[PDB]
């Protein structure tokens, strides 16, 4: 553990600290985003550790700014730090040039900070899906501890990742409606969850190209989707 | 060079800071130190090493500031130490300086619990930050303030502290707590409290007669307040009494080593 340092490379050119951090993200809750043409949809498993927890307080969906939101997976407390740098960058942009930050720039900015370690002792054990609308329509980007960031038509991260990427290579076509993605979302959550699925137990958000605002779904409106199944 | 790092501030596989633990062992090896709370003051007593003919005194102009084990921190606070002597002197400077800063700022004596917290925070700092060993010291603080009266504290290598009515650190501290537990009571005079301290040291050193040259005793008590200089300070107000820290000499321990040997034969 201390036998080799924070910087060491493996014999096939991976940095150990970064491999291990990615493993950490795998033991996370599951979270995902899907891009239609109209909108971009994000959702997560909550996974409370008991029925004495108030579920509000354990959000895995956070507003970065009016037109973009994130869903995190891996170490929640580390994600709080990234989501704060991103809120600050998005507001510096508006300060300096009086317009909204592009979604790609925001993912770029959050990745710069990921790789500042040697200074911080270790990577962030966190990956983010950022979702929003700018001029290029609905977008969904994913950042990881390597500091790579990447655009996706639909992705998942976490424990149920590898199983959700075989409900994708089947049912996912580029050309779906709001409805079919909001349902495909919950289909995958039901699959790879351990619990029975309930309106309190998951979170869903959309950014539609119609209005360019993130909206967070009530429990009233998540009932309507489990119903449609 | 990082492979030769000892990793003094790194948790180990059970939530345990080994260097904090080993430094506490060092205190258990050290000379016995006892504190007792009484109604008329606090008493601190300590065993000393064995007396070589060839020792000498420092011959200090004032005798109530430091013995071998007792130290004044300020006029309402004193202490005794067990553990690494030079480590104790670094912390005692820290405490003297903090107590006097507080007087500088508020022109009032620092409360003994406030002093104790600053001391223990300094210790905790070498447990979390900085790649070096912790201080290997435990203190007993005797204090008087107007918030809480007489107070006796113990400070451990972790940077923890706790209040007591009687306590013992160093060598035979289980044997000593056993005895205080039995014989302490909430109505003690300061002269009885001194006796009780001497008995407890007599039974941990393992001698029938109390050698007065192997004992140190100090008392934190109150005495009538000196001169009221109402001409140089017309809005000065002194209380009737003020705390004093006193390192009892042999001439005051004569009628008290005598009353501990009449309680040793009648038992």
């Amino acid at each position: 553990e201390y036998d080799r340092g924070v910087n060491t490379f493996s014999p096939e050119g991976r940095i150990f600290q970064i491999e291990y951090a990615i493993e950490a993200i795998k033991l996370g809750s599951t979270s995902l985003g899907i891009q239609t043409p109209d909108a971009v949809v994000i959702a997560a498993e909550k996974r409370v550790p008991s029925v004495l927890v108030d579920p509000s307080s354990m959000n895995k969906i956070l507003e970065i700014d009016y037109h973009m939101g994130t869903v995190l997976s891996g170490m929640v407390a580390d994600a709080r730090i990234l989501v704060e740098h991103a809120r600050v960058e998005a507001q510096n942009h508006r300060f300096t040039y009086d317009e909204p930050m592009r979604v790609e720039s925001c993912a770029l900015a959050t990745c710069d900070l990921s790789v500042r370690f040697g200074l911080m002792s270790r990577p962030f054990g966190v990956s983010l899906l950022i979702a929003g609308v700018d001029e290029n329509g609905p977008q969904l980007w994913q950042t990881d501890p390597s500091g790579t960031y990447t655009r996706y038509d639909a992705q998942a991260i976490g424990a149920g990742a590898e199983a959700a990427q075989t409900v994708f290579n089947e049912i996912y076509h580029r050309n779906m409606t709001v409805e079919e993605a909001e349902t495909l979302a919950v289909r995958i959550l039901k699959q790879v969850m351990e619990e029975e699925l309930t309106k309190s137990n998951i979170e869903i958000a959309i950014v539609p190209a119609s209005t360019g605002k993130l909206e967070v779904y009530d429990q009233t409106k998540i009932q309507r989707i489990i119903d449609r199944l | 060079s990082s492979r030769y790092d000892s990793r003094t501030t790194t948790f180990s596989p059970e939530g345990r800071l080994y260097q904090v633990e080993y430094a506490e062992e060092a205190i258990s090896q050290a000379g016995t130190v006892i504190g007792i709370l009484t109604t008329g003051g606090v008493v601190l007593g300590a065993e000393k090493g064995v007396q070589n003919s060839l020792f000498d005194s420092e011959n200090m102009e004032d005798k109530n500031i430091s013995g071998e084990k007792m130290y004044k921190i300020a006029s309402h606070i004193g202490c005794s130490v067990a553990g690494v002597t030079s480590d104790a002197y670094a912390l005692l400077n820290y405490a003297r300086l903090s107590a006097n800063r507080h007087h500088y700022t508020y022109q009032e004596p620092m409360a003994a619990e406030d002093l104790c917290r600053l001391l223990c925070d300094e210790k905790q700092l070498y447990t979390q930050y900085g790649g070096v060993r912790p201080f290997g010291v435990s203190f007993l603080l005797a204090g008087w303030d107007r918030h809480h009266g007489y107070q006796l504290y113990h400070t451990d290598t972790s940077g923890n502290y706790n209040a007591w009515r009687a306590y013992a650190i160093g060598q035979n501290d289980q044997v000593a707590q056993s005895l205080l537990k039995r014989d302490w009571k909430p109505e003690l005079t300061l002269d009885e409290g001194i006796v009780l301290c001497l008995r407890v040291l007599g039974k941990t050193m393992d001698t029938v007669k109390l050698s007065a040259e192997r004992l140190e005793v100090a008392v934190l008590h109150k005495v009538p307040a000196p001169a009221t200089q109402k001409l140089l300070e017309p809005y000065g107000v002194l209380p009737k009494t003020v705390p004093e820290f006193k390192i009892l000499r042999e001439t005051d321990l004569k009628p008290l080593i005598a009353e501990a040997d009449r309680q040793r034969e009648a038992e």
Binding site: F95, T96, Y97, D98, E99, R102, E104, S105, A109 | -
Partner: protein, 209 residues
């Protein structure tokens, strides 16, 4: 020795529904002398729709033009290759001028360009960066007479749409009058007409004395 010199001269701009026209004179003045009659530093292009136009101290306008040119290159690199709009550069520029609150650029600047709807706009700044978007603007040595004239002919508030051509003639007339009366303004005017198509430029002679 002051850190400040005023090299003189004049700029002026007028907007209309899909174009803006921008003019600056080409004299560079010293102390009781003329360095040259052919300086073109007053106007500086930033994107294909956005210009900066400046008067005051020339060495300062050259610094500000470079600081803007690299903030704009950085935006592009951080924004997927896109250029900031005119509204954004104007906000950027205000921000930057304010930041030297404490040792300021000796510059009277304009950012001039097309908006997002295709229409002209002009932002006039003070030296520390307070501005607004307006249909016309002028600054520099002759500006206290060019400006009531434009107020008069364009707003007509004490009386009872223009082409590119009519607007270019009004400005030509306004610089001609400025050169007759303002001793620090003269020689030529460089005019840029900004449309979505691109940028047309035209020199225009003025009094030499």
């Amino acid at each position: 020795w002051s850190p400040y010199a005023d090299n003189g001269g004049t700029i002026a701009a007028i907007a209309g529904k899909n174009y803006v026209i921008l003019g600056g004179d080409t004299r560079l003045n010293g102390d009781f002398c003329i360095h040259t009659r052919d300086d073109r530093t007053k106007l500086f292009q930033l994107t294909e729709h956005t210009f900066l136009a400046s008067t005051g101290m020339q060495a300062d306008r050259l610094q500000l033009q470079q600081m803007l040119k690299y903030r704009i290159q950085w935006y592009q690199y951080n924004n997927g290759g896109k250029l900031p709009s005119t509204k954004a550069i104007a906000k950027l520029t205000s921000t930057m001028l304010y930041q030297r609150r404490f040792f300021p650029y000796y510059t009277f600047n304009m950012v001039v360009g097309l908006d997002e709807k295709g229409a002209g706009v002009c932002y006039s700044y003070d030296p520390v960066g307070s501005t607004e978007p307006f249909r016309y603007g002028t600054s520099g040595s002759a500006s206290s007479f060019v400006e009531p004239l434009m107020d008069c002919l364009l707003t007509r508030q004490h009386m009872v749409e223009l082409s590119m051509t009519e607007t270019l003639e009004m400005l030509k007339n306004a610089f001609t009058g400025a050169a007759e009366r303002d001793i620090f303004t003269g020689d030529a005017v460089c005019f840029h007409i900004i449309t979505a198509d691109g940028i047309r430029s035209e020199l225009f002679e003025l009094r030499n004395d």
